[PDB]
Amino acid sequence: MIDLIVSQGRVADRAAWMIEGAARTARALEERYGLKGHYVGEPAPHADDDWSVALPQARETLVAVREAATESIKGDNLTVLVNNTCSVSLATLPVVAREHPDAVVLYIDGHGDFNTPETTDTGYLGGMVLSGACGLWDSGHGAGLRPEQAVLVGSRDIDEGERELIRKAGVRVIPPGEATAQAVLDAVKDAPVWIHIDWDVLEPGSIPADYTVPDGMLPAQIRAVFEAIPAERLIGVELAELNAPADSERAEQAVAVILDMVAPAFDAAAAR
Ligand SMILES: [Mg+2]
Ligand SMILES: [Mn+2]
Ligand SMILES: [Mn+2]
């Protein structure tokens, strides 16, 4: 079955509605699959603070997410985290790497999220997540993920400095036009799999786009990844960064697309 964990505490959020988007996503999953989420953290307003300030402010939420994710990863269920920001994964990815040293992390994101304190232009913690989990800088929440076990999927238009950090560390990049289900399967080989998704990977949703080549990933491409990873190899899934207000029609439509993308994996886990 499925363990649902939901972050509702601020972790460096610079957008207004990502805590609300996580709540609405969790509600849709609860209703579809008959679950009750474990909600962690207290909402706080978004701000443009430096990572050196936002990171300590988030410690209580990050520690609580780490503890809940550890219990779930140690048990027998599919671990599903619905997170306001990618930065929640500074707490979860070190657990995955410790418990499953052979796991491959598919980090599905329009960005590389691979800046360090030395290379960030904006100071935003959310742009430093994968590099922190891989130990290029010290988040205070551990590291241990081998860059050789991390695969960026859907990333594009990466700053040339950050792209070479990625290359030197050994992180593979599969851009949207290469991100077929088989390309992702070939990257994972026989490994167990952790899937992390930032919804900014998606092509902006003017779906009447039959005569133009998309720059982002299409929902069908994400669905095809969830269809291809064998249920017995899937460790867990993190869904992050839906920026949509509570009670908006926009959030209603967004979560319907999300449920369609994740259904192959979640349906299998609920039937395990
Ligand atoms: Mg499991
Ligand atoms: Mn991200
Ligand atoms: Mn992103």
Whether residue 49 is annotated as binding a ligand: the answer is: no
Resolution of the deposited coordinates, in angstroms?
A: 1.5
CA angle 251, 257, 259 (to 5 degrees): 100
Quote the ligand 2 centre to 271 CA distance (angstroms): 30
Distances (CA, A) of 110 to 68, 90, 153, 198, 233: 28, 18, 8, 7, 25
**Residue 176 near residue 214, CB atoms below 8 Å:** yes
Quote the ligand 2 centre to 89 CA distance (angstroms): 10
Question: Shortest CA distance to 41 belongs to which of 27, 25, 26, 62?
Answer: 62
Quote the ligand 2 centre to 113 CA distance (angstroms): 6
Range of the domain at 172: 1-271
Widest CA span in the chain: 48
Structural biology method used: X-ray
CA distance 267 to 272: 9
Whether residue 198 is annotated as binding a ligand: the answer is: yes
Any idea which ligand is nearest the CA of 79?
Answer: 1
Whether residue 267 is annotated as binding a ligand: the answer is: no
Any idea which ligand is nearest the CA of 3?
Answer: 1
Residue 8 tokens read as: 């509702």
Distances (CA, A) of 214 to 23, 176, 197, 203: 29, 8, 18, 6
Any idea which ligand is nearest the CA of 114?
Answer: 2
Question: Shortest CA distance to 236 belongs to which of 44, 103, 134?
Answer: 103
CA angle 244, 249, 255 (to 5 degrees): 60
| Sheet-wide strand order for 193-198 | 38-40, 2-7, 78-83, 234-240, 193-198, 104-108, 150-153, 172-174
Three-state helix/strand/coil letters over the chain: CEEEEEECCCCCCCCCCHHHHHHHHHHHHHHHHCCCCEEECCCCCCCCCCHHHHHHHCHHHHHHHHHHHHHHHHCCCEEEEEECCHHHHHHHHHHHHHHCCCCEEEEECCCCCCCCCCCCCCCCHHHCHHHHHCCCCCCCCCCCCCHHHEEEECCCCCCHHHHHHHHHHCCEEECHHHCCHHHHHHHHCCCCEEEEEEHHHECCCCCCCCCCCCCCECHHHHHHHHHHCCHHHEEEEEEECCCCCCCCHHHHHHHHHHHHHHHHHHHHHHCC
Whether residue 102 is annotated as binding a ligand: the answer is: no
Number of domains in the chain: 1
